[PDB]
């Protein structure tokens, strides 16, 4: 449930039409944490299980509490891991539409990797959802070099990490409803806009 390696375990012959790459929060389990699987369930209902690949960011991404203090909200090693997953999706399945997401430190990681991506690949990312975006205030609510209309930020009232401080209050732990509904909904809508039916 909390670990999905569909891209890593996939190949060109079985390519899905949609590939979702997701980065968990600090200290979360597996490579999807608490929010990732909910998004996944929704995606799988919309596209079939065969029509979508779910991939969490693992490897060098350890989701360390200390890394949040680094200049871009995570280590440069984690940034290289996620960037490498986008490259792999492009290599294995050039025809697939990409979608991404991240929670807390994972939101900073998602933003950093996307900012750094080759524009050709970044163009294929139809939508990105961020929850408890630690760099929300600093990045004025968006991802550098990526279109705003493609980005959706979920920041609860009272979630201090959205207002510039690294302080965890209960609202930061309350994104389950968003992950279960409006987040995957937005993603499906963007993929449908670039693919149709
Ligand atoms: P994020 O990495 O979130 C986890 C606590 C879930 O937290 C920062 C604000 C320390």
Swiss-Prot record:
E.C. designation(s): 3.1.1.74
An example Gene Ontology CC term for this record: extracellular region
SS bond partners: 15-93, 155-162
pH dependence per the UniProt record: Optimum pH is 8.
Effect on the protein upon substituting residue 68 to A: Increases activity on poly(ethylene terephthalate) (PET) and decreases activity on polyamide 6,6
Regions that span the bilayer: none
Biotechnology: May have promising applications in chemical and textile industries as it is capable of hydrolyzing a variety of substrates including soluble esters and insoluble triglycerides. Can hydrolyze and thus modulate the surface properties of synthetic fibers such as the plastic poly(ethylene terephthalate) (PET), or the textile fibers polyamide 6,6, polyester and acrylic.
Temperature-dependent activity: Optimum temperature is below 30 degrees Celsius. Optimum temperature is 30-40 degrees Celsius.
Post-translational modification: The 2 disulfide bonds play a critical role in holding the catalytic residues in juxta-position; reduction of the disulfide bridges results in the complete inactivation of the enzyme. O-glycosylated; contains one mole each of mannose, arabinose, N-acetylglucosamine, and glucuronic acid.
Regulation of protein activity: Inhibited by n-undecyl phosphonate (C11Y4). Inhibited by paraoxon.
Annotated localization: Secreted
Active-site residue numbers: 104, 159, 172
GO MF annotation, one: cutinase activity
Chief localization: secreted
Any single Pfam family the record assigns to this protein: Cutinase
Keywords recorded for this protein, A-Z: Disulfide bond, Glycoprotein, Hydrolase, Secreted, Serine esterase, Signal, Virulence
Function: Catalyzes the hydrolysis of complex carboxylic polyesters found in the cell wall of plants. Degrades cutin, a macromolecule that forms the structure of the plant cuticle. Allows pathogenic fungi to penetrate through the cuticular barrier into the host plant during the initial stage of fungal infection.
Family the entry assigns: Belongs to the cutinase family.
Protein name: Cutinase 1
Annotated organism of origin: Fusarium vanettenii (Neocosmospora pisi)
Higher taxonomy: Eukaryota, Fungi, Dikarya, Ascomycota, Pezizomycotina
């Amino acid at each position: 449930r909390t670990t999905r390696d569909d891209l890593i375990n996939g190949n060109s012959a079985s390519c899905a039409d949609v590939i979702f790459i997701y980065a968990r929060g600090s200290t979360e389990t597996g490579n999807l944490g608490t929010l990732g699987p909910s998004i996944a369930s929704n995606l799988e209902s919309a596209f079939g299980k065969d029509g979508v690949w779910i991939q969490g960011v693992g490897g060098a991404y350890r989701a360390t509490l200390g890394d949040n203090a680094l200049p871009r909200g995570t280590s440069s090693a984690a940034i290289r891991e996620m960037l490498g997953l986008f490259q792999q999706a492009n290599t294995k399945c050039p025809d697939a539409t990409l979608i991404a997401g991240g929670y807390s430190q994972g939101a900073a990681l998602a933003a950093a990797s996307i900012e750094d991506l080759d524009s050709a690949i970044r163009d294929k990312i139809a939508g990105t959802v961020l929850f408890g975006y630690t760099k929300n205030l600093q990045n004025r609510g968006r991802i550098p070099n990526y279109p705003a209309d493609r980005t959706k930020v979920f920041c609860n009232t009272g979630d201090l990490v959205c207002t510039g401080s690294l302080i965890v209050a209960a609202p930061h732990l309350a994104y389950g409803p968003d992950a279960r509904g409006p987040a995957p909904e937005f993603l499906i809508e963007k993929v449908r806009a670039v693919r149709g039916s």
